[PDB]
């Protein structure tokens, strides 16, 4: 008669690694690394993302006429922009401090477009002929919908002296621009005055731009350029404008109604008609694992990203052959 001491075994083929030995077969294990995703861009917790599609953040905000889909977009969870959006600045040029502004959007979930300077209020300058074949809409020449390319009226461009007061509770993003024409002829042709400027001021801002005239390589048929600027007009502060010509005046500006957690995500994927609590540029994640290896840039309540191909903890003991 006898009594023996022993331990459990089973049909498990699960393997775990250790320092001294690899591929040890064990009775029980626990995977802790999520390797799968759904391959889609989804609502984050019910709140759909802003999917710019073929537009860029500049095209959207300046109101590139190819970007009317985003003429008035509701609150978003995150933003999705392609790597090289085709519809950026239809009239060639620059966007000053573009990246600092993009960074600002990562703290913004909702804009409200409002009209600060009406188009019909420009009684001494021509406001409805500021259009280019570089910015076509529906077969016709058009322009950035949120700014006004003001030109001379009956051969006079008198000094502009306008002011807007932010009476709203909410911070106000304001955008304007300067036109850099191709030659001395175009300068007088569009604006009369040979030497011009745009002076802009707020409580913090002390700007004064001058057009640089030069013949340049043609982009979208244009040798001239448009340099765009922006500021955040605080509540109860006022922005001053003054110009001889070349002024690209604001018509619409955006109220910052909601701040908080957001991100600009670079991805070629479109909308997935879908919901999730964790989103990545390649797809969304639905798991209770403490880790994943899908992609480092995520948004939402997510597992922690590691570069591993495999993380498996032993729970049971060494399984017998």
């Amino acid at each position: 008669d006898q009594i023996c001491i022993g331990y459990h075994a089973n049909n498990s083929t699960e393997q775990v690694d250790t320092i001294m030995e690899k591929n040890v077969t064990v009775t029980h294990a626990q995977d802790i690394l999520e390797k799968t995703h759904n391959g889609k861009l989804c609502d984050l917790d019910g709140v759909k993302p802003l999917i710019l599609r073929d537009c860029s953040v500049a095209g959207w905000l300046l109101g590139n006429p190819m970007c009317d889909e985003f003429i008035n977009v509701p609150e978003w969870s995150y933003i999705v922009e392609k790597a090289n959006p085709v519809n950026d600045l239809c009239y060639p040029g620059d966007f000053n401090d573009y990246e600092e502004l993009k960074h600002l959007l990562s703290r913004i979930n909702h804009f409200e477009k409002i009209q600060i300077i009406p188009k019909s209020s420009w009684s001494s300058h021509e406001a409805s002929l500021g259009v280019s074949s570089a910015c076509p809409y529906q077969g016709k020449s058009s322009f950035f919908r949120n700014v006004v390319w003001l030109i001379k009226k009956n051969s006079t461009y008198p000094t502009i002296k306008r002011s807007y007061n932010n009476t709203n509770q909410e911070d106000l993003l304001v955008l304007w621009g300067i036109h850099h024409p191709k030659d001395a002829a175009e300068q007088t042709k569009l604006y009369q005055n040979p030497t011009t400027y745009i002076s802009v001021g707020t409580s913090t801002l002390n700007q004064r731009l001058v057009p640089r005239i030069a013949t340049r390589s043609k982009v979208n048929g244009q040798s001239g350029r448009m340099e765009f600027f922006w500021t955040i007009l605080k509540p109860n502060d006022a922005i001053n404008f003054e110009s001889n010509g070349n002024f690209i005046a604001p018509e619409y500006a955006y109220k910052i109604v909601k701040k908080g957690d957001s991100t600009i995500m670079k991805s070629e994927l479109e909308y997935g008609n879908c919901n999730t609590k964790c989103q990545t540029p390649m797809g969304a994640i639905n798991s209770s694992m403490p880790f994943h290896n899908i992609h480092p840039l995520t948004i939402g309540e997510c597992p922690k990203y590691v570069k591993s191909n495999r993380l498996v903890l032993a729970t049971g003991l060494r399984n017998s052959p």
Binding site: I5, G6, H8, P290, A314
Partner: protein, 162 residues
């Protein structure tokens, strides 16, 4: 293993013992069978469960990457930003992979230890009332029916009685 029991002096595990991680097998005139040792098994479950949660919890606070864009003449700080984000991923990847390796080793040895301790527990009761066979088994000098067997699993094996 470090403690010599699992895949050591006990050559293999038991397919037949289903309701525990460690236990006993008896053989006498009335029959034979397996019985799980509840106390050491539940000890093992509590330890491994706390470990996993300890692991999961320590890794919960960990670096998160953010979107940051730079223009064509901000290459230096773009590169800095890339080296920084990548640097932390390598650190946390190393941390995670190493912790798993190290603790897997400790988990396997812990099971080895629990078996060795269970074996010694029985050895210390039976003392010289049984032959230590060298393979995890004890051959009794007296006959040992199911009450006798149960008394060994109890801890109550009345040594002087036999």
């Amino acid at each position: 293993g470090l403690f010599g029991a699992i895949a050591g002096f006990i050559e293999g595990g038991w397919q037949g013992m289903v309701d525990g991680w460690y236990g006993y097998h008896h053989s006498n005139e009335q029959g034979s069978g397996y019985a799980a040792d509840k106390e050491s098994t539940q000890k093992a479950i509590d330890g491994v469960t706390n470990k996993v949660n300890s692991i999961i919890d320590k890794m919960n606070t960990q670096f998160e990457a953010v979107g940051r864009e730079f223009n064509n003449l901000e290459r230096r700080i773009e590169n800095l930003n890339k080296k920084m984000e990548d640097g932390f991923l390598d650190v946390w990847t190393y941390n995670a992979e190493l912790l798993v390796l190290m603790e897997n080793e400790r988990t396997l040895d812990f099971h080895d230890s629990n078996v060795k301790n269970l074996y010694d527990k029985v050895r210390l009761q039976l003392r010289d009332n049984a032959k230590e066979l060298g393979n995890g088994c004890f051959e009794f000098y007296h006959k040992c029916d199911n009450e006798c067997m149960e008394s060994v699993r109890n801890g109550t094996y009345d040594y002087p009685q036999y």
